[PDB]
A paper describes a structure:
DHS (EC: 2.5.1.46) is a cytosolic transferase involved in the first enzymatic step of the unique post-translational modification of eIF5A. DHS catalyses the transfer of 4-aminobutyl moiety of spermidine (SPD) to a specific lysine of eIF5A precursor, which results in deoxyhypusine formation. For its catalytic activity, the enzyme requires nicotinamide adenine dinucleotide (NAD) as a co-factor. In physiological conditions, DHS forms a homotetramer.
Also, the structure of apo DHS reported herein is the first structure solved in the absence of the co-factor NAD. DHS crystallised in the P3221 space group with one tightly associated homodimer per asymmetric unit (ASU), with two active sites located at the dimer interface. In the refined structure, the electron density clearly defines the residues ranging from Ser28 to Met363. The loop containing residues 79–83 in chain A is poorly ordered compared to the rest of the protein, so these residues were not built due to insufficient definition by electron density. The core of DHS consists of five parallel beta-strands (S1, S2, S5, S6, S7) forming a Rossmann fold that is conserved in proteins that bind nucleotide co-factors. The same is true for all of the five complexes analysed in this work. This analysis suggests that the tetramer form is significantly more stable than any of the isolated dimers, and it is in agreement with the previous findings. The A:B interface of 2822 Å2 and ΔGi of −21.4 kcal/mol involves 17 H-bonds and 16 salt bridges. This interface forms a binding pocket for NAD and SPD.
Author numbering:
A (entry chain B), C (entry chain B): 28 to 363
B (entry chain A), D (entry chain A): 28 to 78, 84 to 363
The structure:
């Protein structure tokens, strides 16, 4: 039995003690503390060695990524890549702290575009008419100029030319994950999430990669240079194989939609994730998968019955940097 | 202005008058009334006489308003499946967009039913009894066994047709085929293929159909689903429309993909959203329609509406006051 | 076991069948159907006769209201009285369909003001600066002119003069419920909820009655005519007594805050309500009473363990007229 | 302007820098940064030297900014009780507004603790074991038995003082007395009465304290709690302030009552809201600060901020970056 007690600022501003006191504060502060515990459990498992038997089984994929004792799936929605959480995610990928990424089309393209031009702070209440007249697009309380996509087009079209040529003359069979790896290699910029992902052999899955500006540009490109194919079936085999041959898995899911469902569905193939943390603001009452509690996924076998999953009901822009500070960042030396 | 006033039950109960009174009741009741007006504007425009197939690569004839209907998977698990099936059966909408679950659960419902449960049922006990929870709904594991048995011979034919008849499969082409195969008038996708209403679902692998494709590929390798051609197909539906309307139930890719197609024509002329998402986390799912105006996904002169509500409650009422009143004009 | 099935519009627009089909539609449509059942259970109980023994016990209050077999508490927030749901509530009170009202200060004063001047439709996005400059106040997507409160002041001050005189010369001991009854008698208008409540001996509780325009006016009035006292302790005895000596109770609670907690707390005094329907958009995750599920109240004894309470997660402006259409309005003849 | 950029953990972990980076991270992180700026503006104004007691009927000296702090009952059940107690202990705010639960649970915590539980615990089992649920917190029935035993002799004295010493009780006067009686430095209300910080709670009867007053009145009749004099007291705090700031955690009466007092001076100069309510149902709880601007509850030249978040997460971080940095100036 654990008593409720908040941090006592008469002790001064001891930030580490303040964060640890969330666990006994109640409501979503307590869920934050539980999330720290769950993520630290994933990390402690990941750093355990593989036994001979575990190594044999985990080695049964054609993946270049070194084996570890816990394969961590990180999912996030496009808005988080527009936000400063892009830097948080890039750090984790840079230092091989996660093993598989899942995101939406916007979550791919906006990382690359940020290497060409920035996103700016705005306000939620800015009116669309006046923004449109000024060539400014709104993302929550963030703003991106139209010219950002012009720059993206100039950068991307010559790459699409090469990809079509490689498909038609060198037998390349493109999928979303293969395309994302190539784009990360091309951007060649250490501020990019996808640069680090391809450098570190972290695959990125995005089965609806066409739903955004990258798709727009493939669309226009296809009328002058037709025939590019992105197969989603091979990518399904690839993500599912990462779950099936994992020793243990953890899911860290920021937001809802496909990123949440696709990571969870991959883990159904192994009979469930061993660890899981959700951070989102969706609610269960409309029946949506996005708003379902982790315990819904337990009924399906997407999360193991003996797991202790956690959902933090909060905007991940507030919580995720704090979570990383208390978990992965404390074990940085082990990942270097 | 317009004064607030609710329905007066001293009149007795006339349901049409009760629904009409929502417009002057305030808060989301007023937004419901606004949504009725917008959908009726879409319908009236669609019924205006017109004075294409090679640029769209579609056999569907153009009308004066191309209506895109998008909905999330949970709504197909719900009774709203019947509402959507009605609209598609009578050719009242032109393009469907849904998630993988929104395809497969319509087909599975032709094989076995979904049941009522409760949100609070615990996962451990359900899993031990072979029952999967979908909100306050329940589906037995056996539903997916029946789906597997039904689907595997169709996948065999699809691979054979790809490799020897030159078929280039995409999600929309697969969904048309599955609707033809299920051959059941309770099915949304049966009616969609019969009426040449395309269905787009770029992440069609993210669900049980994906599971089945995956398992099948180790018995019969080689199936390819291309998403690029499907982007061309949906985008050209918007580009060559005379007018467009968007009716979007929920968030995620169904919302973004319909709106992105309409960005290609510099915006939809009419738009109604029904969902429970909120803007404050910056998500596209939760964004107000006026965010889409800044992008050009909705025209500046449009009068879009969002109803903040569970569509299981609101969408049947909306259909009752719009499409179902115009049933004669659609025959 | 009940199968999911929605209304089939191939049958035509049969509105009663459409509403009944909510029960098998799922998510909050199913909760709506469950709410119809719960409210119809309250009504069927209310119309049962009292046995000799039940009558003896129910008669143990000094209340003028006739005894029934189910005392129904109706709570609602101020915004709903600004909305058209004011008419829904007035109808129930007019026809003696509920027994006790609980609301906030705004929920009292805005009913009275609507008898003097209307509320208008606006938009949520209208900016406060320009509204303030034009003397217009915003309530969600509704609008009220400043002059509404000027009219209220002119109407109310002479009544406050009389109330102070009656306190000081006739020994009247005012409470919120006694004041609300007097204001309803004074407004003398069949469009008013509180007119009908006092005519029908339905008490209205509002322990924070001072938190609004009526309080503002009492405040100003007290400097020229000091000494008005509103005692909340006597009103606590009065509401609690209505629960303690009820044969059965039902709670219909629209929204959160004090109206929700005060009705539930009264029912703790009898060891719990027999029937309960909540309609609100609040969520549980921040720990608030407003967003708590009915099953939280079961732990306290505010709702009986054998009850089948229901929450509908929706804006009551959409749901409550539909609920009334399917329940109370179907038994109108019995209440006349 | 300002570019978006998050904290770079390649720097290591400096928590001050991490919190500062929220301002440029976007969405509610940006609103948190804005809230820090607004609260620091309140504090800096409060610390400006000044160049009252009869018109306010208060002994509390005026400062250059009168800060109203409002919070709901659940936050006193939570660990935020310690956060609030710290601010009141050091005289950092001037007026408190809370619900009945927000008074009684502070006092009860001096007699017995609240425990961690889970939101999903079922009411039947908890009730059978004499445990009451508050979100994911738990309190045994015995806590209220201890409260009763502690409170009944105090109520006896209060009635005696009303009837023979002319005391005219109101909620704020009762809350001051209960804080003096609990005589425990862990208590918010102990520190509030010691520092002459009034506490307003117009529906003080809506809770366990009400229960106890009710039961007590059948053993010792006659206690009166007047809410009208307390309206005069809170309103005059706003009317005669030099500047005001509002820090409001949650909704309901605590939010509306603080804002109504500030309407009396044609608006607060600074305002920060932290709550999870949404606007779409028209509720005051969910209204954006800009609704209060239309009424005159917030000045038009103010720069109010709402953080859409559970205050159990955000309020300790906010205090860490504002009041707790200025601790030396408050001594």
């Amino acid at each position: 039995s654990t008593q409720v007690r908040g941090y006592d600022f008469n002790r001064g501003v001891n930030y580490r003690a303040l964060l640890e006191a969330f666990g006994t504060t109640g409501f979503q502060a307590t869920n934050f503390g539980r999330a720290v515990q769950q993520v630290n459990a994933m990390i402690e498992k990941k750093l355990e060695p593989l036994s001979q038997d575990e190594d044999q089984h985990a080695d049964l994929t054609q993946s270049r990524r070194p084996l570890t004792s816990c394969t961590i799936f990180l999912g996030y929605t496009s808005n988080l890549i527009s936000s400063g959480i892009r830097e948080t995610i890039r750090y984790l990928v840079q230092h091989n702290m996660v093993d598989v990424l899942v995101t939406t089309a916007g979550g791919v393209e906006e990382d690359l575009i940020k290497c060409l031009a920035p996103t700016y702070l705005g306000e939620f209440s800015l009116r669309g008419k006046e923004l449109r007249e000024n060539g400014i697009n709104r993302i929550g309380n963030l703003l991106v100029p139209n010219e950002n996509y012009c720059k993206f087009e100039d950068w991307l079209m010559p790459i699409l030319d090469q990809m079509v040529m490689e498909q038609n003359t060198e037998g390349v069979k493109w999928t979303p994950s293969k395309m994302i790896a190539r784009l990360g290699k091309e951007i060649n910029n250490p501020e990019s999430v996808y640069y680090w992902a391809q450098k570190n052999h972290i695959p990125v899955f995005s089965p609806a990669l066409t739903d955004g500006s990258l798709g727009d540009m493939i669309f226009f490109h296809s009328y002058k240079n037709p025939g590019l194919v992105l197969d989603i079936v091979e990518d399904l085999r690839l993500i599912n194989t990462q779950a099936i041959f994992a020793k243990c898995t953890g899911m860290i899911i920021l937001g809802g939609g496909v990123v949440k469902h696709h990571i969870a569905n991959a883990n159904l193939m192994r009979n469930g994730a061993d660890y899981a943390v959700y951070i989102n603001t969706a609610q269960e009452f409309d029946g949506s998968d996005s708003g379902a509690r982790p315990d819904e996924a337990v009924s399906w076998g997407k999360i193991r019955v003996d797991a202790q999953p956690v959902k933090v009901y909060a905007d991940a822009s507030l919580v995720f940097p704090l979570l990383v500070a208390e978990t992965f960042a404390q074990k940085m030396d082990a990942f270097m």
